């Protein structure tokens, strides 16, 4: 309830250390992806992602992003494989923007940004609850996708519309029956490595997994996404555009590619 952090000049990314020490630790997320220094790693599996049973509940504007929440009491939605030990559940996706196309991703490939990045975020089912989870080295699992900008996503556009009703922070929507498997790329080629979560409290809970393959959305599409509001209804507006980190130092860390 005292949490003022945010993505402003004055509360933004080199702020958190303040009050979120962690910031400076040595598993911190976003990265830049060198392609040419990752290596190729033929013991990795393939990535497993069974979202056929998936149980979308909500869409929330949090003041940060907006979650789109999942039902992650049952082994419904769950991603497993590529580099993990067990069974990781699905519990909600969000993304990160720019005021401008060329711009919003967190992980950059080769120092290019992408327009947004969608964050699929699980936790590992050995440590029974998302609380517990964050607690630990091997908590989570994200599966992040680049956007860039060009043909419309069709699975997207669900999301985009629901957003008039969530524009300032604090609103929600039912979001029920949405399919999470229409946000995927063809191929589930993937980079990994271990890190944290993007946003206070950063905790280096997360094992990272970034497609190789953006996915297209329109520029009609990411456009609705700046129209979402950071401030609270009845507060001066303040649009929600460039709420991403940028990237932090690998320190001693090894990116792999499993292709
Ligand atoms: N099942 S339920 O009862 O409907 C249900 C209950 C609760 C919830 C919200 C979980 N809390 C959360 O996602 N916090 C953000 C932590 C975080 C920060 C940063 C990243 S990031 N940017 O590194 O990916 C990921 C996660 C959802 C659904
Ligand atoms: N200085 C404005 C108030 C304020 C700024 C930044 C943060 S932090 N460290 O959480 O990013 C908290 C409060
Ligand atoms: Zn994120």
């Given at each position: 309830m005292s949490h003022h952090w945010g993505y402003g000049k004055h509360n933004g990314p080199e702020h958190w250390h303040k009050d979120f020490p962690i910031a400076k630790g040595e598993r911190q997320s976003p990265v830049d992806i060198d392609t040419h220094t990752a290596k190729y790693d033929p013991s990795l599996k393939p990535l497993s992602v069974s979202y056929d049973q998936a149980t979308s509940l909500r869409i929330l504007n949090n003041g940060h992003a907006f979650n789109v929440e999942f039902d992650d009491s049952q082994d419904k939605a769950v991603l497993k494989g590529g580099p993990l030990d067990g069974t990781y559940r699905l519990i909600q996706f969000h993304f990160h923007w720019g005021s401008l196309d060329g711009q919003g991703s967190e992980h950059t490939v080769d120092k290019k940004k992408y327009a947004a990045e969608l964050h699929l975020v699980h936790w590992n089912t050995k440590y029974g609850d998302?609380?517990?989870?964050?607690?630990?080295?091997?908590?989570?699992?994200?599966?992040?996708?680049?956007?860039?900008?060009?043909?419309?996503?069709?699975?997207?556009?669900?999301?985009?519309?629901?957003?008039?009703?969530?524009?300032?922070?604090?609103?929600?929507?039912?979001?029920t029956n949405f399919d999470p498997r229409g946000?995927?790329?063809?191929?589930?080629?993937?980079?990994?490595?271990?890190?944290?979560?993007?946003?206070?409290?950063?905790?280096?809970?997360?094992?990272?997994?970034?497609?190789?393959?953006?996915?297209?959305?329109?520029?009609?599409?990411?456009?609705?996404?700046?129209?979402?509001?950071?401030?609270?209804?009845?507060?001066?507006?303040?649009?929600?555009?460039?709420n991403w980190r940028p990237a932090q130092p690998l320190k001693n860390?090894?990116?792999k590619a499993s292709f």
């Open positions: 998302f609380g517990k989870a964050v607690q630990q080295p091997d908590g989570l699992a994200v599966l992040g996708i680049f956007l860039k900008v060009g043909s419309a996503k069709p699975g997207l556009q669900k999301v985009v519309d629901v957003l008039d009703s969530i524009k300032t922070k604090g609103k929600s929507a039912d979001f946000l995927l790329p063809e191929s589930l080629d993937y980079w990994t490595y271990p890190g944290s979560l993007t946003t206070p409290p950063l905790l280096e809970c997360v094992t990272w997994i970034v497609l190789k393959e953006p996915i297209s959305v329109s520029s009609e599409q990411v456009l609705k996404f700046r129209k979402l509001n950071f401030n609270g209804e009845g507060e001066p507006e303040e649009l929600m555009v460039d860390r090894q990116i």
